[PDB]
Amino acid sequence: SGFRKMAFPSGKVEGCMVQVTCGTTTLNGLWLDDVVYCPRHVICTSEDMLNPNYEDLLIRKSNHNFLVQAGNVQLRVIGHSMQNCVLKLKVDTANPKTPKYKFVRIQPGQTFSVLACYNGSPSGVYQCAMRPNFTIKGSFLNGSCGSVGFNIDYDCVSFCYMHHMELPTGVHAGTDLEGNFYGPFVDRQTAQAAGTDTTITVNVLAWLYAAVINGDRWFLNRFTTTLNDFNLVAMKYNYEPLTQDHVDILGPLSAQTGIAVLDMCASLKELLQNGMNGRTILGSALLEDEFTPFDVVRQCSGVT
Amino acid sequence: SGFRKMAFPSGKVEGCMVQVTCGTTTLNGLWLDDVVYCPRHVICTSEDMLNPNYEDLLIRKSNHNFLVQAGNVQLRVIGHSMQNCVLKLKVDTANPKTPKYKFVRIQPGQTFSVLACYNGSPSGVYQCAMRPNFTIKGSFLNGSCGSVGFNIDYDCVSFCYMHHMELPTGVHAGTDLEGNFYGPFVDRQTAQAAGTDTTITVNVLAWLYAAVINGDRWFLNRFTTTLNDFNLVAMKYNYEPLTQDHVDILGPLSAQTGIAVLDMCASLKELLQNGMNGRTILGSALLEDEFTPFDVVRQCS
Numbered sequence: 001s002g003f004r005k006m007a008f009p010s011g012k013v014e015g016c017m018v019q020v021t022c023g024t025t026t027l028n029g030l031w032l033d034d035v036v037y038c039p040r041h042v043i044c045t046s047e048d049m050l051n052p053n054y055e056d057l058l059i060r061k062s063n064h065n066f067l068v069q070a071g072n073v074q075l076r077v078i079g080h081s082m083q084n085c086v087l088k089l090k091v092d093t094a095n096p097k098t099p100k101y102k103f104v105r106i107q108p109g110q111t112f113s114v115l116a117c118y119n120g121s122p123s124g125v126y127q128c129a130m131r132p133n134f135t136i137k138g139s140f141l142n143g144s145c146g147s148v149g150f151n152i153d154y155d156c157v158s159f160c161y162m163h164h165m166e167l168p169t170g171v172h173a174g175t176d177l178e179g180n181f182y183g184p185f186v187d188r189q190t191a192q193a194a195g196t197d198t199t200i201t202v203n204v205l206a207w208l209y210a211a212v213i214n215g216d217r218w219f220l221n222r223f224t225t226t227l228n229d230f231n232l233v234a235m236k237y238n239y240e241p242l243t244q245d246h247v248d249i250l251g252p253l254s255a256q257t258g259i260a261v262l263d264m265c266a267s268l269k270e271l272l273q274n275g276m277n278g279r280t281i282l283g284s285a286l287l288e289d290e291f292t293p294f295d296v297v298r299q300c301s302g303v304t
Numbered sequence: 305s306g307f308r309k310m311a312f313p314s315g316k317v318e319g320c321m322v323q324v325t326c327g328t329t330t331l332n333g334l335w336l337d338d339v340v341y342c343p344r345h346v347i348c349t350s351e352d353m354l355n356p357n358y359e360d361l362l363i364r365k366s367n368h369n370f371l372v373q374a375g376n377v378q379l380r381v382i383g384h385s386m387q388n389c390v391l392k393l394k395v396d397t398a399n400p401k402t403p404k405y406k407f408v409r410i411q412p413g414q415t416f417s418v419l420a421c422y423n424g425s426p427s428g429v430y431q432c433a434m435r436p437n438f439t440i441k442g443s444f445l446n447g448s449c450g451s452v453g454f455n456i457d458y459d460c461v462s463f464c465y466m467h468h469m470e471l472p473t474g475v476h477a478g479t480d481l482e483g484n485f486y487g488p489f490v491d492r493q494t495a496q497a498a499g500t501d502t503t504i505t506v507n508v509l510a511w512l513y514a515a516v517i518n519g520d521r522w523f524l525n526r527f528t529t530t531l532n533d534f535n536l537v538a539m540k541y542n543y544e545p546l547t548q549d550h551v552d553i554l555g556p557l558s559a560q561t562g563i564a565v566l567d568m569c570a571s572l573k574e575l576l577q578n579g580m581n582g583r584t585i586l587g588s589a590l591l592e593d594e595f596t597p598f599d600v601v602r603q604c605s
């Protein structure tokens with residue numbers, strides 16, 4: 001038993017991280033087949049930005065301006081091209097450690113692991129959720145741009161995130177692997193801020209089911225409620241609305257435990273109103289919203 | 305930036321996880337060079353959990369009784385010996401993915417990453433600490449025995465934990481990679497319980513320093529304390545005694561922030577007395593005790 005914030009094994013992604021330098025700017029790139037993917041702002045230098053068209057700066061750059069380091073072997077850049085906010089560097093040699101992979105875009109509330117890297121070298125791995133305000137609460141280290149977020153299915157790595165910037169409130173913003181930003185952000189050095197965040201209701205419920213599976217039951221009660229009644233309570237406590245799809249998703253946990261979703265919502269509605277009264281749930285005095293229903297099932301199953 | 309509980313990249317350990325089967329018992333093994341390390345209770349049947357005679361069970365085993373499987377490939381066992389509570393299976397093939405490694409026995413309060421595995425296949429990685437009662441609060445299902453805990457410092461993997469059992473309270477017990485259990489536990493199904501768990505005081509202090517470094521100061525106060533007066537108060541909240549070694553270890557962080565160690569102790573005393581009053585420190589509503597002084601220093605704080 002036990003429940004922990006659990007990231008995917010990062011080995012398949014570790015074999016993909018390379019160092020990318022252009023001028024003084026050094027960050028991380030993702031080496032798959034013969035392409036290195038990295039944030040396009042690597043080519044920006046503190047003097048040239050005069051309301052630029054990015055392809056103006058890019059067409060001034062030669063292949064040899066891109067120093068790509070895979071550990072110690074230097075990768076020869078033989079082409080460059082822009083894909084939204086991502087820069088695609090064609091290299092002469094394919095990555096022999098390229099895993100089976102796909103580029104996917106995730107929805108807010110979905111979770112993924114991040115392999116925090118510095119100068120092409122993996123430093124740590126953590127599990128996080130795409131917040132409703134399209135940010136993620138991530139790592140401390142500078143020079144982490146180009147670190148990627150991913151999920152693993154069986155053998156297949158689904159890349160969903162590349163880190164681009166830090167926001168003034170300590171959170172991070174990034175794109176999918178096709179360079180499309182998550183959220184209303186731009187990859188320039190201008191003043192931006194995250195919008196007011198909300199709590200991922202369906203994930204909190206999934207975490208409550210995990211607590212029940214692990215013997216934490218004190219918050220259960222005899223009552224049930226309506227999706228209407230609960231969503232009115234959720235909106236006042238800055239919780240995402242709970243849709244009928246969310247209830248269906250929680251179906252398996254509702255069957256494994258005997259606690260119906262609206263039955264469990266009655267427990268959550270009491271918790272939002274009256275608090276925990278000094279008690280904890282799974283060793284926490286806050287309501288955790290960074291476990292999806294399938295995170296709970298996976299961890300309380302044994303999927304490998 | 306934000307302060308995050310980060311596990312080590314698990315790739316170097318992933319390449320060493322294998323599956324070990326004896327009879328109907330299957331668990332995970334650690335394959336390093338030409339040795340596979342695994343918990344010795346893999347040779348226990350049903351009638352062996354309460355009073356296993358491991359020497360008796362082991363003397364009746366041949367090499368071909370041990371089925372080691374690395375991915376799709378079966379490994380051939382050519383020798384076996386027992387070292388304390390771990391089995392050491394010599395195999396015919398050195399693991400080509402063996403990293404630079406060492407075996408380290410850790411002390412309470414130390415942190416490490418755990419690669420949870422099932423049937424020799426890695427399933428997830430998370431960060432743990434050795435509790436003062438020599439247990440860990442992991443996440444382990446049946447089949448996860450033989451999963452290992454480790455740190456990675458400069459491409460060298462230091463293996464410090466191998467999982468052996470779950471206690472009644474839902475916490476977990478295991479050994480170092482030389483097979484010596486952490487704490488007073490044994491690989492018997494007999495009644496044994498963990499000592500009352502306490503808070504790792506030196507870790508909470510270091511976490512408070514990290515909060516100051518990250519710009520959070522609301523919990524500081526005017527007072528200092530003597531070391532002994534601090535420990536008298538903290539024992540009342542089931543906090544671990546703070547030693548002079550703990551004071552010295554925090555020296556760098558005190559210097560970095562200009563807050564004397566015994567000054568931070570006084571603030572922790574007041575936090576215990578006052579609670580948080582709905583506030584948070586580094587995003588948490590409880591006092592976090594699974595970041596070591598070392599962790600916060602090289603978290604570039």
Ligand SMILES: *[C@]1(O)C(=O)Nc2ccc(F)cc21
Pocket residue numbers: 040041042044045049052053054055187188189
């Ligand atoms: C460059 O100044 C930078 O850092 N980001 C970016 C985006 C688009 C552009 F045209 C230039 C830059």
Ligand SMILES: *[C@]1(O)C(=O)Nc2ccc(F)cc21
Pocket residue numbers: 026027142143144145146164165166189
């Ligand atoms: C990015 O290049 C990186 O690695 N760190 C960082 C900090 C701030 C920023 F605007 C961009 C980056």
Ligand SMILES: *[C@]1(O)C(=O)Nc2ccc(F)cc21
Pocket residue numbers: 330331445446447448449450468469470
């Ligand atoms: C461990 O070997 C495992 O995988 N399951 C299990 C159950 C009970 C026990 F004492 C040890 C283990």
Ligand SMILES: [Mg+2]
Pocket residue numbers: 220221222223224263264266267
């Ligand atoms: Mg109820």
